[PDB]
mmCIF file of all heavy atoms in Angstrom:
data_model
loop_
_atom_site.group_PDB
_atom_site.id
_atom_site.type_symbol
_atom_site.label_atom_id
_atom_site.label_comp_id
_atom_site.label_asym_id
_atom_site.label_seq_id
_atom_site.Cartn_x
_atom_site.Cartn_y
_atom_site.Cartn_z
ATOM 1 N N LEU A 91 253.901 -10.168 53.559
ATOM 2 C CA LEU A 91 253.811 -11.077 54.783
ATOM 3 C C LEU A 91 255.119 -11.814 55.160
ATOM 4 O O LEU A 91 255.257 -11.929 56.475
ATOM 5 C CB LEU A 91 252.677 -12.140 54.514
ATOM 6 C CG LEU A 91 251.148 -11.813 54.600
ATOM 7 C CD1 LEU A 91 250.860 -10.933 55.813
ATOM 8 C CD2 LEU A 91 250.512 -11.227 53.389
ATOM 9 N N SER A 92 256.036 -12.010 54.298
ATOM 10 C CA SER A 92 257.474 -12.362 54.798
ATOM 11 C C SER A 92 258.000 -11.363 55.620
ATOM 12 O O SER A 92 258.680 -11.628 56.710
ATOM 13 C CB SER A 92 258.399 -12.665 53.470
ATOM 14 O OG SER A 92 258.458 -14.013 53.350
ATOM 15 N N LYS A 93 257.780 -9.992 55.294
ATOM 16 C CA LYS A 93 258.147 -8.913 56.158
ATOM 17 C C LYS A 93 257.378 -9.054 57.413
ATOM 18 O O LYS A 93 257.994 -8.757 58.491
ATOM 19 C CB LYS A 93 258.196 -7.590 55.341
ATOM 20 C CG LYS A 93 259.616 -7.190 54.997
ATOM 21 C CD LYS A 93 259.809 -6.033 54.015
ATOM 22 C CE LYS A 93 259.446 -4.669 54.675
ATOM 23 N NZ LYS A 93 259.471 -3.593 53.636
ATOM 24 N N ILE A 94 256.171 -9.373 57.587
ATOM 25 C CA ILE A 94 255.431 -9.610 58.806
ATOM 26 C C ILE A 94 256.156 -10.656 59.691
ATOM 27 O O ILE A 94 256.431 -10.315 60.855
ATOM 28 C CB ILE A 94 253.922 -9.906 58.675
ATOM 29 C CG1 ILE A 94 253.119 -8.920 57.830
ATOM 30 C CG2 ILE A 94 253.316 -10.131 60.044
ATOM 31 C CD1 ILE A 94 253.166 -7.448 58.495
ATOM 32 N N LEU A 95 256.551 -11.789 59.158
ATOM 33 C CA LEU A 95 257.310 -12.770 59.995
ATOM 34 C C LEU A 95 258.596 -12.228 60.594
ATOM 35 O O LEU A 95 258.962 -12.422 61.644
ATOM 36 C CB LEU A 95 257.610 -14.172 59.250
ATOM 37 C CG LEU A 95 258.889 -14.600 58.886
ATOM 38 C CD1 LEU A 95 259.303 -15.913 59.501
ATOM 39 C CD2 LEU A 95 258.904 -14.965 57.361
ATOM 40 N N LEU A 96 259.372 -11.488 59.645
ATOM 41 C CA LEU A 96 260.673 -10.881 59.940
ATOM 42 C C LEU A 96 260.426 -9.764 60.962
ATOM 43 O O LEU A 96 261.277 -9.509 61.967
ATOM 44 C CB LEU A 96 261.405 -10.483 58.738
ATOM 45 C CG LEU A 96 262.786 -10.085 58.968
ATOM 46 C CD1 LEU A 96 263.782 -11.338 59.294
ATOM 47 C CD2 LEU A 96 263.369 -9.496 57.713
ATOM 48 N N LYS A 97 259.396 -8.926 60.830
ATOM 49 C CA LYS A 97 258.950 -7.900 61.666
ATOM 50 C C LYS A 97 258.588 -8.497 62.974
ATOM 51 O O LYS A 97 258.905 -7.893 64.017
ATOM 52 C CB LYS A 97 257.740 -7.055 61.083
ATOM 53 C CG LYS A 97 258.262 -6.065 60.019
ATOM 54 C CD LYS A 97 257.043 -5.517 58.985
ATOM 55 C CE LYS A 97 255.826 -5.126 59.775
ATOM 56 N NZ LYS A 97 255.907 -3.987 60.554
ATOM 57 N N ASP A 98 257.809 -9.571 63.084
ATOM 58 C CA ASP A 98 257.500 -10.244 64.415
ATOM 59 C C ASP A 98 258.749 -10.589 65.191
ATOM 60 O O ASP A 98 258.872 -10.389 66.399
ATOM 61 C CB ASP A 98 256.676 -11.450 64.153
ATOM 62 C CG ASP A 98 255.220 -11.149 63.588
ATOM 63 O OD1 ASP A 98 254.726 -10.033 63.794
ATOM 64 O OD2 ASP A 98 254.747 -12.095 62.914
ATOM 65 N N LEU A 99 259.806 -11.102 64.489
ATOM 66 C CA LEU A 99 261.089 -11.372 65.083
ATOM 67 C C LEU A 99 261.844 -10.124 65.399
ATOM 68 O O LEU A 99 262.206 -9.925 66.552
ATOM 69 C CB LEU A 99 261.942 -12.282 64.076
ATOM 70 C CG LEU A 99 261.711 -13.825 64.268
ATOM 71 C CD1 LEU A 99 262.687 -14.339 65.265
ATOM 72 C CD2 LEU A 99 260.421 -14.292 64.653
ATOM 73 N N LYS A 100 262.064 -9.143 64.508
ATOM 74 C CA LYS A 100 262.799 -7.845 64.832
ATOM 75 C C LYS A 100 262.004 -6.818 65.726
ATOM 76 O O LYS A 100 262.424 -5.864 66.200
ATOM 77 C CB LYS A 100 263.271 -7.196 63.539
ATOM 78 C CG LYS A 100 262.105 -6.710 62.599
ATOM 79 C CD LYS A 100 261.716 -5.304 62.853
ATOM 80 C CE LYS A 100 261.933 -4.360 61.612
ATOM 81 N NZ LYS A 100 263.338 -4.114 61.346
ATOM 82 N N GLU A 101 260.778 -7.218 66.002
ATOM 83 C CA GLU A 101 259.988 -6.750 67.017
ATOM 84 C C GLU A 101 260.357 -7.315 68.368
ATOM 85 O O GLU A 101 261.118 -6.864 69.140
ATOM 86 C CB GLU A 101 258.447 -6.754 66.959
ATOM 87 C CG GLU A 101 257.799 -5.783 65.895
ATOM 88 C CD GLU A 101 257.403 -4.491 66.578
ATOM 89 O OE1 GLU A 101 256.193 -4.406 66.994
ATOM 90 O OE2 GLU A 101 258.171 -3.449 66.704
ATOM 91 N N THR A 102 259.931 -8.698 68.528
ATOM 92 C CA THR A 102 260.106 -9.295 69.980
ATOM 93 C C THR A 102 261.516 -9.931 70.190
ATOM 94 O O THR A 102 262.001 -9.841 71.311
ATOM 95 C CB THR A 102 258.956 -10.340 70.086
ATOM 96 O OG1 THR A 102 257.755 -9.587 70.265
ATOM 97 C CG2 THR A 102 259.096 -11.250 71.260
#
Side-chain angles (χ1 to χ4, degrees):
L91 280 323
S92 266
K93 262 167 76 183
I94 305 298
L95 111 121
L96 193 70
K97 280 161 47 68
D98 293 334
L99 271 272
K100 68 89 122 287
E101 285 269 273
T102 289

